[PDB]
């Protein structure tokens with residue numbers, strides 16, 4: 227499995243593969259990702275940090291942008307409190323094993339030269355395009371604010387100012403990234419990770435929607451969250467439990483079952499798991515049990531590293 | 537005529553009179569106005585500079601903002617060229633007799649503290665309100681840009697950052713000023729001057745609509761412009777020639793006429809002129825002739841001061 231294929235594993239799209247292949251030849255190459263700081267760090271975050279680790283193992287210098295200023299524009303509170311949550315997020319990401327450079331957006335996003343280019347980009351970006359780019363990111367607001375259309379330009383200029391080779395994010399970011407590729411003289415390679423479904427199956431996993439597993443949830447919390455989750459027999463699309471099996475579990479995987487329900491089942495790949503589940507050969511309750519227990523084990527070192535701090 | 541009434545003369549509104557009366561008691565008081573730099577300086581500009589002179593004679597420190605950065609946001613070109621036109625505008629205003637402090641917006645509008653407050657205001661300003669405030673200011677654009685909604689916040693923060701007591705502008709500015717009075721902790725007194733009608737009577741006088749008299753137009757140019765202008769007998773509303781008589785001419789005024797059309801007519805006030813014109817006792821052609829000749833004389837020292845430079 228080449229470095230390209232390691233990077234591509236479990237991504238939704240790379241814009242573009244040819245461009246990534248050219249970046250991979252260089253000795254010095256940088257990848258970055260920004261996060262609005264979040265009170266809880268969940269599996270959606272972890273999926274993305276795992277992708278940054280892949281890039282790091284492929285020789286990329288990694289930068290994690292603690293996006294305090296964009297969080298501010300997106301109505302998450304006061305900068306000082308946002309920054310505090312940002313420092314906590316850094317600790318969690320470090321507990322996930324990511325050794326990287328962490329920078330607050332506001333360290334550079336208020337520089338006169340940054341601002342002037344934001345205003346320069348504002349002349350080239352229609353209100354219509356800016357709002358469309360924010361549809362999956364902007365806080366719900368019946369009276370949308372000017373801040374909502376500043377946010378995407380801020381993000382677009384961020385890739386430019388810092389000179390990054392590769393930008394990583396969830397698929398929600400793809401319209402802002404498309405805008406950046408259209409407006410900036412250097413085209414940034416964009417790696418988009420899938421958006422995980424919330425545990426109740428009704429929307430996307432989100433720290434503000436209460437439908438997530440946090441990386442530091444207790445084992446009994448993880449078990450109860452998964453026990454309650456949407457997981458219809460034979461359906462994989464929009465099935466959060468199957469997504470967790472796909473994106474976080476190591477294979478081969480042994481699903482423990484009572485003898486009276488078939489006894490223990492060993493699954494050599496997610497793909498085999500998907501066949502078993504689609505064929506209603508594997509029952510939701512047994513899938514849930516295996517997913518819960520293997521997820522607890524995967525998250526335990528993170529939870530424990532954070533616990534050692536207390 | 538008290539200082540208050542001198543200031544109020546020929547204004548469309550003061551927001552608010554009580555607030556202005558309190559400002560007038562202070563020893564130290566500042567008034568400012570911003571202009572997007574303009575290739576030609578016209579009677580609309582002059583009307584506003586005349587109002588600033590009134591404020592100066594009432595003891596106000598006067599600041600003229602050469603609004604290079606807002607002009608940039610409003611698609612008037614590159615900053616360097618905008619700034620050059622700004623320096624020309626300063627010379628014209630000086631030739632009008634205005635001794636004041638001239639500052640380019642960009643000297644302070646890119647400071648980190650300015651920018652942060654712009655983003656702070658962007659959180660409090662809806663897109664809907666921002667666009668409505670720009671309806672009479674924004675360049676025509678079938679695909680409105682993010683820059684259009686940054687502009688009004690920029691202007692709102694300008695009154696705050698510099699600590700001005702009084703903001704002056706045309707009535708086109710009144711929604712931005714209303715926004716500033718709602719959002720800022722110190723309420724700025726707003727003096728709004730009337731918007732002059734264009735010479736063809738179809739819209740407002742504008743340096744981009746070719747419907748203006750420039751302060752440095754030649755006498756034959758002024759004569760031809762006025763000769764062609766909309767000026768229907770007995771109609772004053774939307775009559776640019778009557779507006780020029782109201783806002784620029786000194787009274788008493790002697791309208792020269794051939795004996796066969798009544799001979800010379802002396803008019804002691806604009807109000808008397810309006811009666812004569814409404815009663816179709818004064819013919820458009822004779823009004824035009826007097827307005828043209830008296831306007832030439834009023835503008836001559838300006839034209840001549842600018843000519844001396846060549």
Ligand SMILES: N[C@@H](Cc1ccc(O)c([N+](=O)[O-])c1)C(=O)O
Nearest residue numbers: 260261262293296331380381384
């Ligand atoms: N939009 C990202 C945060 C983000 C990503 C990348 C960025 O460059 C910036 N930024 O500029 O502040 C911000 C999110 O939804 O969490």
Ligand SMILES: N[C@@H](Cc1ccc(O)c([N+](=O)[O-])c1)C(=O)O
Nearest residue numbers: 361362363364365366432433434
């Ligand atoms: N508000 C949109 C986009 C969005 C999704 C999830 C979120 O957590 C946030 N947010 O809080 O910024 C925003 C929605 O509900 O789909």
Ligand SMILES: N[C@@H](Cc1ccc(O)c([N+](=O)[O-])c1)C(=O)O
Nearest residue numbers: 570571572603606641690691694
């Ligand atoms: N809006 C004014 C220009 C202006 C007036 C006042 C101001 O404070 C600023 N500004 O902030 O740049 C700009 C015009 O239409 O010409």
Ligand SMILES: N[C@@H](Cc1ccc(O)c([N+](=O)[O-])c1)C(=O)O
Nearest residue numbers: 671672673674675676742743744
């Ligand atoms: N574009 C609007 C507002 C406007 C009026 C006059 C103007 O000169 C400009 N302009 O050029 O910025 C803009 C209109 O035509 O009414």
Ligand code: NA
Nearest residue numbers: 251252253254
């Ligand atoms: Na080498």
Ligand code: NA
Nearest residue numbers: 561562563564
């Ligand atoms: Na005194």
